[PDB]
Coordinates of C-alpha atoms in Angstrom, one line a residue:
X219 CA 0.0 0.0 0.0
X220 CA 1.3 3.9 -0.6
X221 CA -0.7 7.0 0.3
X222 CA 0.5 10.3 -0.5
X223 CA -1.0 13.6 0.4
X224 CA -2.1 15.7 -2.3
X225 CA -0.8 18.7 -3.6
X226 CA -3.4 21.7 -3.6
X227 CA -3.1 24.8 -6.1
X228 CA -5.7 27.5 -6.4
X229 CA -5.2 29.9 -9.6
X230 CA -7.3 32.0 -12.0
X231 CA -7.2 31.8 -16.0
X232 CA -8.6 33.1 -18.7
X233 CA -9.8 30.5 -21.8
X234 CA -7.4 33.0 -24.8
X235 CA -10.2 32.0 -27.1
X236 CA -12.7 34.2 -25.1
X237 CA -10.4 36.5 -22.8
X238 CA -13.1 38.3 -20.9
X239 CA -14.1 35.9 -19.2
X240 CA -12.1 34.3 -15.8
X241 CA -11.8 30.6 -14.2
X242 CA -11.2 30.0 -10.9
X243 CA -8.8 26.5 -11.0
X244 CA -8.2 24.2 -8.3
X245 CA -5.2 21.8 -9.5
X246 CA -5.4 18.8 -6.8
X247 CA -2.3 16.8 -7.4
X248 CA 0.4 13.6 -6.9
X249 CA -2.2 11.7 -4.3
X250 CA -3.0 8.1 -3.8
X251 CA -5.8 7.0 -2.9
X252 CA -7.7 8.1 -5.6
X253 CA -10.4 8.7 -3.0
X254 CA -11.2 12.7 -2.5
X255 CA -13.3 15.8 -1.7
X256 CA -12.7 18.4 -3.5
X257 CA -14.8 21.6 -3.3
X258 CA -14.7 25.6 -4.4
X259 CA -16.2 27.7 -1.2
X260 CA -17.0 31.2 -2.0
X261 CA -17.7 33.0 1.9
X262 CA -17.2 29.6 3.1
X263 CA -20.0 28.5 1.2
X264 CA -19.8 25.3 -1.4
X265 CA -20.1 26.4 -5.2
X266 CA -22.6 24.1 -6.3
X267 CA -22.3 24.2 -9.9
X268 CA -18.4 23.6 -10.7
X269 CA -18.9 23.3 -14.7
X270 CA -14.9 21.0 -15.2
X271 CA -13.6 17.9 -13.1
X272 CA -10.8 16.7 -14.9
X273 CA -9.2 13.3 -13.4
X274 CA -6.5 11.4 -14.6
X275 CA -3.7 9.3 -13.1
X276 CA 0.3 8.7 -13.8
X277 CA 2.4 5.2 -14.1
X278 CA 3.5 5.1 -10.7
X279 CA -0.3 5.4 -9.0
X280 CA -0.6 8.8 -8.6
X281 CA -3.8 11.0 -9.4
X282 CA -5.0 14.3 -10.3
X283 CA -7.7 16.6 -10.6
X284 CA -8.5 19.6 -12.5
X285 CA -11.4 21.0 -10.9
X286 CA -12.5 24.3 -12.3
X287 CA -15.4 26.9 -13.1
X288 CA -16.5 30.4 -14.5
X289 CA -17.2 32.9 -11.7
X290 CA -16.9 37.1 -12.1
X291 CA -14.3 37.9 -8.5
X292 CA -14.7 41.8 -7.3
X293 CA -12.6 42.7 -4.5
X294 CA -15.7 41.8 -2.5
X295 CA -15.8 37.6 -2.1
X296 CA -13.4 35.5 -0.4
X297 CA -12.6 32.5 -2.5
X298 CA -11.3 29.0 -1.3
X299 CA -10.7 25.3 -2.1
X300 CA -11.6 22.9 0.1
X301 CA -10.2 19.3 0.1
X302 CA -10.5 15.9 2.1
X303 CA -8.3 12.7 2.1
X304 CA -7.7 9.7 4.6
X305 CA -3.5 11.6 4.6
X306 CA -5.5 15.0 5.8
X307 CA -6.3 15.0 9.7
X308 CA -8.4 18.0 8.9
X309 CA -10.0 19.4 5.5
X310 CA -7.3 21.6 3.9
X311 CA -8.4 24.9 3.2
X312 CA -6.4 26.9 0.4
X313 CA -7.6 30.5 -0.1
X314 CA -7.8 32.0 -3.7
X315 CA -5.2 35.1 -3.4
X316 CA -6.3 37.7 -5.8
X317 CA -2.9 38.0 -7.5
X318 CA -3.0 34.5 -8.6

């Protein structure tokens, strides 16, 4: 058996074939098992409707997720992702920074 904790990266984009509009990314990464929560909060909230989950694994057994959606920021909302796994005594929270 292996386990291995998952990296978590929280980052904005913008599709270049329609530049106006922005994605807010969570790229879940290197963990084993394949077994996971992964959610966007906005105020601590859950985002319900999370239009990409993306999932795919490496040859050494080794997973990751691509977990993204469309939202429209403002300096108003705190943004977060939100992620469970048997190597994660507590839920990891990683806040979307603004500059990212």
């Amino acid at each position: 058996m292996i386990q291995r904790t998952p990296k978590i990266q929280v980052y904005s984009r913008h599709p270049a074939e329609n530049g106006k509009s922005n994605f807010l990314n969570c790229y879940v990464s290197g963990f084993h098992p394949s077994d996971i929560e992964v959610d966007l909060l906005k105020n601590g909230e859950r985002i319900e409707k999370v239009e990409h989950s993306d999932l795919s694994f490496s040859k050494d057994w080794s997973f990751y997720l691509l977990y993204y959606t469309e939202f429209t920021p403002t300096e108003k909302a705190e943004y977060a992702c939100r992620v469970n796994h048997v190597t994660l005594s507590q839920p990891k929270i990683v806040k979307w920074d603004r500059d990212m």
